[PDB]
Amino acid sequence: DDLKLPRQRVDLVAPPFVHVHEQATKQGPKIMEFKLVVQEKKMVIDEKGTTFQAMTFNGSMPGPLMVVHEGDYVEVTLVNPATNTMPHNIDFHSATGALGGGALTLINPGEQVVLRWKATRTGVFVYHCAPGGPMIPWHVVSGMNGAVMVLPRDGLNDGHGHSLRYDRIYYIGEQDLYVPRDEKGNFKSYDSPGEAYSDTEEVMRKLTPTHVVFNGKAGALTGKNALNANVGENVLIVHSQANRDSRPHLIGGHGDYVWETGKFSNAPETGLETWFIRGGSAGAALYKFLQPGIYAYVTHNLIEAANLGATAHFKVEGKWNDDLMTQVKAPADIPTGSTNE
Amino acid sequence: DDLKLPRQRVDLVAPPFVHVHEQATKQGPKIMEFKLVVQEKKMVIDEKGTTFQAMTFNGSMPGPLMVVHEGDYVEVTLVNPATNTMPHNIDFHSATGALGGGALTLINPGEQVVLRWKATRTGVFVYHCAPGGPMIPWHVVSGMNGAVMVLPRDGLNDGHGHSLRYDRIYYIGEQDLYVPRDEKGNFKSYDSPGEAYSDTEEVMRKLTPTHVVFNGKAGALTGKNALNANVGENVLIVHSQANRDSRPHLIGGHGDYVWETGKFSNAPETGLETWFIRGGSAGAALYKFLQPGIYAYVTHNLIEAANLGATAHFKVEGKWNDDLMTQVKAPADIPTGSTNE
Amino acid sequence: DDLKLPRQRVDLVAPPFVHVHEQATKQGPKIMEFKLVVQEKKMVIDEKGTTFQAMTFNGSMPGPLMVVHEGDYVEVTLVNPATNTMPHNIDFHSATGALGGGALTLINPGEQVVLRWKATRTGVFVYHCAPGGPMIPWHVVSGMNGAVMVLPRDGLNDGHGHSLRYDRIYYIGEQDLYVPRDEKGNFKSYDSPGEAYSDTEEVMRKLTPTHVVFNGKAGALTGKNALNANVGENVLIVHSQANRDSRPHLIGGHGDYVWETGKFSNAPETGLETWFIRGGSAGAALYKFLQPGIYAYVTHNLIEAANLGATAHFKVEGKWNDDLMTQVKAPADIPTGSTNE
Ligand SMILES: [Cu+2]
Ligand SMILES: [Cu+2]
Ligand SMILES: [Cu+2]
Ligand SMILES: [Cu+2]
Ligand SMILES: [Cu+2]
Ligand SMILES: [Cu+2]
């Protein structure tokens, strides 16, 4: 029975940015058309230049953020070009049936498939490859995961009948990576994903990542690729982790409104220091910036954040508020008449 | 001062099934009588036939689910037959006092004990053995844990004054196991739990399980022992983990109503993708099936799920709903006029 | 523009105790003055006498609990005596701007600094050292973390317009430690923190602690240093973990009211068995004791609790309530006419 709704093609953009969309809409349901192209390729994952045999949707880790509204249909063309070596598919945690779509989307290199799913559940959700068996974790931890956001048609709210609107949105995809090492402790390089598999599975089995990164590599969102904001902006930070828990924290800020389980039918929590993304989910936090400067956005296992790759920066422009915080006295020598025992 | 209430003897059944019970009841408080028999025995825990020196309540991992109502008294006869080698006891996280009952239930082989506890707290709760000291984790991770559900007398509700009723209930007990390996990496076999202890404690200390299983073994709830349901049924899935965190996910479904901390005085969250069972607790999720077919129920550390044992299946009978999801175009060769870069 | 409020100097006390404070207050905003003195020193961390090159605020692990009210200003003098070897600073997760204060408080040995932050966010919050880069996790897991509580001016409430008042408060700081071992498996000793660093970082990278302790060492809060309470007392248990998740559980009790994300603008959950402290946060639980005796307070990874150090005790005085729990029959030989198969 043909579905007779307007169609809208969406052009995806690379994370941490997000394709243009409306928060609140008075448009009715549409068939929102997306295309995802699998790309297997070697990628650089840390500041020392370590390479890795990655598998991606659309060439990025994470895959791009898709944004639709409650009641939309999402029609995804998944493409597996013949330059790839492996079968792939896609499972939407936002979707109902057929293992999230995985059981309807298995494609060999040289094939494509078209899946439609109704966006009946609001929130942010993981999508990921899941070919079957041990290939499920391996494809996911090789990079084949992203997220989709299903907004209410009226946009976000605080769970107490007040509208919330963001000025800016970023998508932070966190990736646990399992890179083999040689006898001397150095990371091993491989010429294909298949050649990396046996050694990689051994590291995966011990459940300790070698790298934990945002946007696919250590330092991806620091330096010149810091995330911009301004004092007074309400920023939505979507965070996903398809395989492993995370505990996001904005250093020098808070989560004003946080959906840590990521589902907008639930009221957000207020004023959090650190929140929790259960592996296999996306969550989201709003924050209104009150102070200029550098903020570091981390998982608050600080070992993961500083030593395994999992730090991003915000650079925030505006005027410093000395009422909220001030340096009363700059560093100075301890007074000779001081005690301090 | 004798407690003068009606007595009701309950016959426990092996997980993942649950003894017969009422959801809502107009019966008053009763003394609900249960018997648990400790059994130490070698068990098979994975598809390659690895054996393990297990310690169980009632012969199963997990121990059986007990179901009572708020205000009932629970009178448990714990039996430690003389064929066992170790002292045992029981701690109910549902109970108040004496380390959950552990300090009143320590029995040598050849002894039994009778504990009564008042069911003053609603929810699903872990029970486990806890003899003292290092024996506490060892007995628990050897299999000596289960759960108890304390229903409100009016049954479940959504926290907004609406009754929730399940058509079916399953109890998923998740077990982290620590099996020693020899120099060549093969799992070691032992002739008794005591002989396994020193090598097992060394694996336990590194906090990385070798196996993570549902119902006591990899593949326990797949194949012919898949969990049955039908389209339209509201299914309650109780999940426990006595020692280690888990992140349950129903692949192709959702948690319609989830008590991830497991306590029915709290409103459930709605529409979750993945939830979180903190080690040392039970949680519960309701889901109304909307689509037929195979569903995989996992912890969403997919390495744990696919490679360490932690996958169950549901087989759901009914009619496919092409409005919720459809394969618009089956796999086909990528059109020659396609781009895709 | 000078801040013209009354000043109040607070004398900090060593955990698990808490400096004197008011729950509800009709005092207006004050400038609450605290001093923290960094101390680098070797400390004993387990029952076998293992030593560790620790770095502390005020000589303790955790650092002391600070208590203020919403709207207060907190003026902290941080002192780094010249006997220390390292630069240090402080990041308050309660504060807004400048990386929580870290970017305004970096002091060399021989220096002090004065930071003021406005207590605009209610809850319990972590504070920790964070000098930069890999020094951030290393200073934190070396012991440089504590917590601050920002009470509402009206004190705590249940989120449903009812006042909650504690009779007693304890602060449980949980510390993950990473102690190197030699070839034979024995813990290594070092003459300075700098000398320990390279070997310690290698252990940190594998993300598995060697020790998980409350109040700085295994057994700190057992034996003669058990935590006292009485039947009928409402006890607030503040729990922090600056780097790694925890799952607190009071064995033989419950969490009557739990703020597991730790922020008093959110209603607490009721009747929990086990709660979850996300690494990089503090949470809090109220419990009214109903039974006398020993209670064990653990993280409910029981391996961590029994074998890595993470057990505390409460010793509770009062009268046993046989309605809540009773030993119906003491241990006895299994009756000869029993079955039990
Ligand atoms: Cu794939
Ligand atoms: Cu999934
Ligand atoms: Cu036992
Ligand atoms: Cu327990
Ligand atoms: Cu420091
Ligand atoms: Cu921090």
Numbering used by the authors:
A (entry chain A), B (entry chain A), C (entry chain A): 2 to 342
Paper text:
CuNiRs catalyze the conversion of nitrite to gaseous nitric oxide (NO2− + 2H+ + e− → NO + H2O) in the first committed step of the denitrification pathway. The two redox Cu centers are coupled via the neighboring Cys-His residues that form a conserved hard-wired 12.6-Å ET bridge. A two-domain blue CuNiR from a Rhizobia species (Br2DNiR) has recently been structurally characterized showing an unusual oxidized T2CuII-(His)3-(H2O)2 coordination site, requiring the displacement of two water molecules by the substrate instead of a single water molecule in a prototypic CuNiR.
Online optical single crystal spectroscopy has been combined with the MSOX X-ray crystallography approach using a single blue Br2DNiR crystal maintained at 100 K in the as-isolated state (i.e., in absence of nitrite). Optical spectroscopy prior to X-ray irradiation confirmed that the T1Cu site was in its oxidized [CuII] state, as expected from studies with other blue CuNiRs (e.g., AxNiR). A total of 20 crystallographic datasets were obtained from the same spot of the Br2DNiR crystal with a dose of 0.4 MGy per dataset (estimated by RADDOSE-3D(25)). Following exposure to the first dose of X-rays, the optical spectrum showed a clear loss of the optical absorption peak at ∼460 nm and a substantial reduction of the peak at ∼595 nm. A crystallographic MSOX movie of serial structures to a resolution of 1.35 Å while the optical spectra were reporting on the redox status of T1Cu allowed us to define structural changes resulting from the T1Cu radiation-induced chemistry throughout the structure including the catalytic T2Cu site. Data collection and refinement statistics are provided for dataset 1 (DS1), DS5, and DS20 in Table 1 as representatives of the data quality and refinement for the individual structures. The first structure showed two full occupancy water molecules (W1 and W2) coordinated to T2Cu as was previously observed for Br2DNiR, with W1 more closely coordinated. Two conformations of the catalytic Asp residue (Asp92CAT) in its proximal and distorted position are also seen with two conformations of channel water (W4).
